[PDB]
């Protein structure tokens, strides 16, 4: 595309598709994940799928920026999640390998499912197992807020429905990750 | 199936992967799916190996594509063939390894530019 | 055409094996460029193989081919850093503007087919089918004929 | 939020004009970093690698910008003495390299656990950066341990990458560090980052 | 929809229509005629709001 008067003064370098696998592997290492290597080979695949196997919405994004953003959160999450001869290691070793996979999911579930829609929330579940078998999403351990949230609700004559309270929390989490959060909805 | 004829080959194939993972679990040529209607451009099918030919592109009755892991060793000797979406070669679907007629040097096969098309007008 | 730019007061300079390599570049540069009119068979797309690239390569060749033989009227083929010259003319000049991996694959075959120690063998094969082998010479005028 | 006291104060009180003292900070900025880089090389070059107790102290002594260069300059030279010059049985070079591939590998883990602990962000990014860097070193080195027949500290399988070489024997203080990659050679601008 | 209906009803026998009664009740709590009326109304209609009730059947149609 360079002007017809610069395609001989410059040196073109093709940067079509990057190296997510690598970027992710090392990305996790800086967080403290000892599994990273193994992990990355799954986090990336999940993304590639979620983009072509989850209802194509307008507020859906699985670019590189997304993959980096999530991996970064997994760090702080892990920094606050105390981890758990022959057949002694193989068994004990696997357990740890899982602890990391859980922390990773906790991040996906933190800043990846709030984006999901209705018909997509079930599909993502299936996809997550094929990628992260040894685990499944967990609840929102935030009793602190849930307590004060349930108070204001009844105060504003609001129906403290379950699914409802869930979203308010979806914000507190995603906000402490992506300083720029946007709430799309009808 | 008629891959190239579909509306989204990229999707179908990337789906037959996990369906094949739900079972016995990289792609391979010949638990697995079967595609029909392809077209080998540059060579021809013979004795189960890519062989030279004076004719441009020839059809492919059908072929099996398994997702094993193994048979991927003697590739250093085999030839790599891209599976675009059509003659345009402006859209790659998936790479595939296929044995070739070792009569003609490997370098010749490279400069031979051999690829496989899914959709083909007529 | 490729030669109208390559002066004798730069191609006949020591080592003596430099005259060869230049010609090789002209041939390699004449091929890859000639194939653009046979897309998608010649190439997946149409890469801008301008002369500027060629000029750059000549400078690089004049580096490695003149770095490991500065002063000597000759130089041994196997003593030339082809893995260096072929890489520079591959993923940072000619193939630099290549996006399709399979395109580079093709490209590099031409490189590893002309820019190598075996490319010096007397009567090196260029276009066998017709009977075309590298001209045994060591000067500009020599190759021109 | 990082700080790096200069090696030569620039009293603006003396009466320097607007650009007078300004052109000075630029000169000193490069001067400071110039010297610090050398001192860092001296410090690291006098500390145990396994002993991560002191290592964790070495990092918190210099600016992240420099903290990395040192690890890069150190990595560069080590890979050479491990390749020789066309002379050194396959085992020789492969053995010399196996070490570096492991030594740095051990460090990654020491930091991998140190990052998972409590520590500010500013101080963290430094470690997060070092991590990323050492990962490059070990990875690159491994790529070498895959080449059955290597030449020496001049093989392209080594020159392909961007190596960093220091030379305290140099007259200048800036020009001491010479970056290399392929046949190209540049000079570290010493621009505080 | 059922959630919204309650918000309206609740806010009725809670939030006074007249702004004066709201200020006078806010400084007195730390039942003017108005707010008292609202309640009686909310009760008479309440039954129609619940699941399947009038409002729903009409709002849907």
From Swiss-Prot, chain D:
Free-text comment about domains: Dynein heavy chains probably consist of an N-terminal stem (which binds cargo and interacts with other dynein components), and the head or motor domain. The motor contains six tandemly-linked AAA domains in the head, which form a ring. A stalk-like structure (formed by two of the coiled coil domains) protrudes between AAA 4 and AAA 5 and terminates in a microtubule-binding site. A seventh domain may also contribute to this ring; it is not clear whether the N-terminus or the C-terminus forms this extra domain.
Protein name per UniProt: Dynein heavy chain, cytoplasmic
Function: Cytoplasmic dynein acts as a motor for the intracellular retrograde motility of vesicles and organelles along microtubules. Dynein has ATPase activity; the force-producing power stroke is thought to occur on release of ADP.
Native organism: Dictyostelium discoideum (Social amoeba)
Gene name, Swiss-Prot/TrEMBL: dhcA
Localization (cell): Cytoplasm, Cytoskeleton
Family as reported in the entry's similarity comment: Belongs to the dynein heavy chain family.
Span covered, complete protein: 1749 to 1941 of 4730
Transmembrane segments: none
Subunit structure: Consists of at least two heavy chains and a number of intermediate and light chains.
